[PDB]
Design a protein around this ligand. Structure first.
Ligand code: 0LI
Length: 297
């Protein structure tokens, strides 16, 4: 069934129940920006009282193409619904001004910078420790399991696309238009596209197919970011003809030092060249559940 269909976001309904009075939004600092869009912190009144929210709005430079993208984004978040381990949609202002999408604000920011900020404090096996890492590994697989169950393929899963909020709960997100991928070197020109190659499955790279199983490969690379406390993958190794050659041959990363053995076995299986031998996210959630209990006490 689900291997043969996909949701076309332009074919989803937009319910106007999301529409929010744009004069009840007060904008604050920018959290991230791309050419045509940005994500800004904001205050919203009477949305659920004053509350802090995040807003992804189009810049003045933006074209119909980017507006369409943002409207499709709105439709997908509405379609996905609101869940613990995915960024939650709160509202939108799509007329009478810049088109924008309103979500919850995640108070600890994106996971990659957080891990980097916390690397030096790390308590080997408040500060970070192994159960934090396991908890994040679990919550991301769990969120992805839900995405897969809705037949939603992420395509840019990596630590930079995860946010962290209260109680060290992770929220999968996608900055999309509001990231400056031209000046982010994790995105590499490949044809007529800058792509997150070091995170991508071979079949995606060479064949431009993105599947449930290619997201699992990126999750593997994410695991390596996580247990490497925010290190860039394939250190010292530029994307080029040689890098492509080497992934195709079976070259893979060695375990991060802080990864339990079972976590690295998960990474390795995520990285199988045969998409069909990779675990599903449902399976990963199970294995990590067990690890977390074993690692407790
Ligand atoms: C305002 C805002 C609007 C939208 C989104 C957003 O994540 N959009 C999104 C679009 C698509 C998809 C799924 N597709 C992926 C592509 N794929 C090809 C198809 C399926 C998903 C996903 F979560 F489901 F993954 C999310 C995030 C923010 C934020 C924020 C925020 C909150 N706190 C902080 C603190 C610091 C910085 N930012 N920030």
């Amino acid at each position: 069934g689900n291997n043969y269909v996909y949701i076309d976001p332009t074919q989803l309904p937009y319910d106007h129940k999301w529409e929010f009075p744009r004069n009840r939004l007060s904008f604050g600092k920018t959290l991230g920006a791309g050419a045509f869009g940005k994500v800004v912190e904001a205050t919203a009144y009477g949305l659920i009282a004053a509350m802090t929210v995040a807003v992804k709005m189009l810049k003045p430079s933006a074209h119909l193409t980017e507006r369409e993208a943002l409207m499709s984004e709105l439709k997908v978040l509405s379609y996905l619904g609101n869940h613990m381990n995915i960024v939650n949609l709160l509202g939108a202002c799509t007329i009478g001004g810049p088109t924008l999408v309103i979500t919850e604000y995640c108070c600890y920011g994106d996971l990659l910078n957080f891990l980097r900020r916390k690397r030096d404090s790390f308590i080997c096996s408040l500060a970070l420790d192994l159960e934090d890492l396991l908890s994040f590994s679990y919550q991301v697989a769990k969120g992805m399991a839900f995405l897969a169950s809705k037949n939603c393929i992420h395509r840019d899963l990596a630590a930079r696309n995860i946010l962290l909020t209260h109680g060290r709960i992770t929220k999968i997100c996608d900055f999309g238009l509001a990231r400056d991928i031209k000046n982010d070197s994790n995105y590499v020109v490949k044809g007529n596209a800058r792509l997150p190659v070091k995170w991508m499955a071979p079949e995606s790279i060479f064949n431009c197919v993105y599947t449930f199983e290619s997201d699992v490969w990126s999750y593997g690379i994410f695991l390596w970011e996580l247990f490497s406390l925010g290190s860039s993958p394939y250190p010292g190794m530029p994307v080029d003809s040689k890098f492509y050659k080497m992934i195709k041959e079976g070259f893979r990363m060695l375990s991060p030092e802080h990864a339990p053995a079972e976590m690295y076995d998960i990474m390795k299986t995520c990285w199988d060249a045969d998409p069909l031998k990779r675990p599903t996210f449902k399976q990963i959630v199970q294995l990590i559940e067990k690890q977390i209990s074993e690692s407790t006490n």
